[PDB]
Amino acid sequence: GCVLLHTSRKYLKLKNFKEEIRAHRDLDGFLAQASIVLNETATSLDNVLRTMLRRFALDLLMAMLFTVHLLSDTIQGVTAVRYQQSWLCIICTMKALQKRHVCISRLVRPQNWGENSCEVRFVILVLAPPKMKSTKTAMEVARTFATMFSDIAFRQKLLETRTEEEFKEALVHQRQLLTMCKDFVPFGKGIREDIARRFPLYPLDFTDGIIGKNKAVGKYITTTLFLYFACLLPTIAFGSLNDENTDGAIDVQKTIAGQSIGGLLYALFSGQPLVILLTTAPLALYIQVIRVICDDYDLDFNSFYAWTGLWNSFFLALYAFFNLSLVMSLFKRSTEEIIALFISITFVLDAVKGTVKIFWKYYYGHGQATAVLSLLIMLGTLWLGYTLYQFKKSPYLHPCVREILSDCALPIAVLAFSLISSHGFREIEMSKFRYNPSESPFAMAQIQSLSLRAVSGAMGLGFLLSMLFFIEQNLVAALVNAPENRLVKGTAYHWDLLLLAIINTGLSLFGLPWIHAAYPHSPLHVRALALVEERYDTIVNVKETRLTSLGASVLVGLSLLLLPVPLQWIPKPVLYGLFLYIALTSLDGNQLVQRVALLLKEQTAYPPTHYIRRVPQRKIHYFTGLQVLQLLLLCAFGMSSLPYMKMIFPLIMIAMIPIRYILLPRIIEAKYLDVMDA
């Protein structure tokens, strides 16, 4: 009965006692239940293995060990390639075991058990159940002992030991050996250097995936379509929100026009073009507050709105000119993810609040079919978009066709349910955003009309706006420029901030809504243009190009000609489903979200991530809990009914840095915190 024997040899990295705590935990567990065989007189591998098994407690266990050259799993040391015949590590997996059993047996005399086992003196048997954590599997536990025995000096010390207690002391002693401003002075250098880093690479932005090989034409078209829908609809909602707050001073037409002009300019004359500019709800809050201030006094809305925008741009220009973007590097992964998660929650709350608003107005008559259909459309749009989003991992279809279909998840879900609501349910009227003809012919707002005692108030709002703009712009840019994304071209933090002020001051003078780096869209824009290979998921490269951003801006601008059509065929629930879709898809890769899901996870399902290996689980869960506590602080201030607390929200984000670097070290060791950021 001839059979085929498949032998596979792979190099395993030496266990890092300095960094990995599992080695120390496994050594302590072994010391607690030591099974050490001293002066084993058996001259054969079979007898030694049977003796070690008897120390553990049989032919049933002995048989499963084999399939030295007949052993199923073994680990041996190699010297840079000479094998280490001095010691041998035998590994086996048994389904009938509940714990991990490690036995170390020392032979009286060297034994010639094979080509690479001619001088065996130490035999290490590691038995573990198949169902165990990836950090404490049979291979991992053996690597802890293999690394210690890989030292020739340590093996010599073991041979000198005479008693079991001294043998343990050598193991403990070996473990100990293994275990053991100037910037801002040049004000202009930040702006100058960023231009110098980006200007030579400008032509490559328009020909990165168009000219030459690896033509990613389908990716660019899909990403532009994804950006077009993901940007036009929120601006429509924000434009309507401004319309009902400013009583027609700022409408859908101006909001979309500002987004198109600002996006087009940013896509052309800014480094790192993957950042997407969009108006946000906090910006709408400032516009609402400005209207309230202008209502209380005898002040023109456009004049006051322009002046605070001028001060906002002026302070942002100073921030770029003083190279203040460097201090934003203190926002490590610990703080960025919390702020990242908070913004995703806001989009979820906006959809929930909008659904309640529809139910309150229609279902309770402050009719019922509209509210019920609104819930169905919102849930259906989220389901269809998310199902298509996850379709990329499916084995179904041609890889190219599947990638195109999956990357078109948002455009297809919006269009499909827009037809369902508008055409399949014509008899049921649906809530839609208001549309009105042109009212303000893009005036200059008459900045000189406003007098003293009011520009100073605008300066205060402008300074507060600058704090919001400075933090948000750098946070999203840092997320785009995260080390996980390759982006070999470079970063243009200082130049982008200066251009953002230049874009904003133009919008403020014409009364257009302000726009800055929007958190959900930009990484999704990077994620859409990125190439991911299963291993877990790793981004090989990102197609850095201005075509997607520029193309989306043009399409949004062209939508102004046919503006009523989106405002009629696309109801609010479709937008609410879009908000749910982008919020959920933006959490794919969030460090805090994964650890939150980890809390609720069976131990055996814990992935072998870097932070789990280096940081104790107890400390990780404490860090996760503290981050959730910080998240609740953001929710209390950022999503409150009082407008003032929401306006001072950037101060809360600033206050997170002292908590991270002063308060958190007092609770959790600073070394563990640094690993989480890394």
Next chain:
Amino acid sequence: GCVLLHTSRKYLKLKNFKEEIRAHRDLDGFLAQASIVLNETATSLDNVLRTMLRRFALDLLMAMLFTVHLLSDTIQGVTAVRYQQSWLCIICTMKALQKRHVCISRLVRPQNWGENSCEVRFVILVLAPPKMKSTKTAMEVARTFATMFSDIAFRQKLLETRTEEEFKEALVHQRQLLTMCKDFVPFGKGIREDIARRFPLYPLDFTDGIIGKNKAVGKYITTTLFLYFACLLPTIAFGSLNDENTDGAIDVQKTIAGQSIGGLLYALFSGQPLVILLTTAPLALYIQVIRVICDDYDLDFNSFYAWTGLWNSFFLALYAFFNLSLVMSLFKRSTEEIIALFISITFVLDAVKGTVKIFWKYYYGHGQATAVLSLLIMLGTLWLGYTLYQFKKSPYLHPCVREILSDCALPIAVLAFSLISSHGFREIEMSKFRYNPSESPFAMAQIQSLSLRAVSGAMGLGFLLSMLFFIEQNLVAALVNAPENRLVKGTAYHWDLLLLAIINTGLSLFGLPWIHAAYPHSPLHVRALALVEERYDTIVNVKETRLTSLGASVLVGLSLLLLPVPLQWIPKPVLYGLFLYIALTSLDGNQLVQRVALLLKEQTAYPPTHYIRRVPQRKIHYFTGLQVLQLLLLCAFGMSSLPYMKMIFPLIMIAMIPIRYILLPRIIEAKYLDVMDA
């Protein structure tokens, strides 16, 4: 720089040229592009490998080969344990390759390359890309050549060859060598033997998981709860369907009472108690036809209904007494799955037809909020139930808590959305099944009242009913008794058929609806009580017990006391979601469904199933297409508007056997068809 080398040795089964076609395909592909090196004068492994690589076309390729003892992957022959040093098979994986390259090099003289490679004469290098089908991976292709070279006689013949053409002929010649009634005579034995097989095991049915170790108390309670909801609701719909067809002759009270009494009796005095009895839509069609016949003539509905039930039981008694259940073994996996899929489609169509009925009555006013909410509730119930159903595979939660929560998918989904529709949407009226007080006091139907010329017509219906009962009872029992399910106790086909007639004749005399083996519930009952371990999914054992069936029947009977409560708090859309849930969950494991999904699958994602290995893909897809054609035949006859074609549906199922055993062999080879059944 000391490193750790992990070597793993595993026995690989010799490639079966007789059964597996991939071996022949790989050998033909190698012959088409042969890379044979004859009389290699190199005395070192490195030079031979470099020469073979040059024949393929380098140090980059050479480096990836290693990490003989330094080779990453190798296959060697073992004699029952002596290694075969004559030949060696080297395996490597390269991401830069597009095809599979195999090279065979013969050495002039034996070389001593190691302990197990002291007489190397043949070197086999197999290079394949990582992304390939599981049947044609690097290991699989090497196994084809390893099996051929495992024969010492074949290696001697290769040494005798002088030219490359003769070397190919030896490879071809080696491939050829590797490639190359009485029953029914005892009428009563069927009934007697089944009782003898089940009577000694009767006490074990009530103490299989209650007394002793492995107490599966949570499984029994959950399964009883699952069966209670999965049975009570369809009987409610069928009872209402009978009420609107028979104009009050048969109502919800009688249908539930018949289900409870029939289920309780079957759970007690029947072998293989995992079979669940329930009324079906085709049975309701016969009741509707009986009412129409009784309306056309001057015949009592109860008298005619009882007589056809008497003949149905009489013919079923003869079928059990003549051991006719044996011929049902001809319904192999080829025909059972098609019938299995068809019944699942009927439950899907019933939910769809019911949804259209609600929309037609309410949305179009033949109001709108009811129809829209009905769609939302139906889709929501399916989503929540299916999400909880798939929660069992999740790493989330405690394994015990997760298993209990996931196995309660149907009860939780029904109860949760019943509260949502009845209590969360009180203002929106929902379609509900009719409830009326008791009208018929369980009479005996006065069988003797009916005269001649009408009992003969009942005999015709009874014979047609017997055909439906005989086929359906055996098909579901065969699915329960499938080889995948262990069920070490045995089978009681003949006894179950006789008892089914005894149960049915009692129901017919009292005017209760007939019940037989229901396809969706019974395997799900087996699946709920089964233990599944990931490998793919394999059922270790099934907890065979009568408690779940008996407990569910009692709960259904007790529901008659509080009958209005389910008929009010549970609307039709919740039931429609239940129909969608059971239909979809019943396809988990369907052979036809998996092959249908296979059609739409990328080649690299093809699982290494037995039928793929033995049967060509082209023939598999032809077999899948023919089965779909047979499915369309069932759909045309079984789900048509004409009642007569639906009544003769059992004839269509009978006609499938001649197609399988006479028509299918004419198109696809009989050997391939037998593999599909196996």
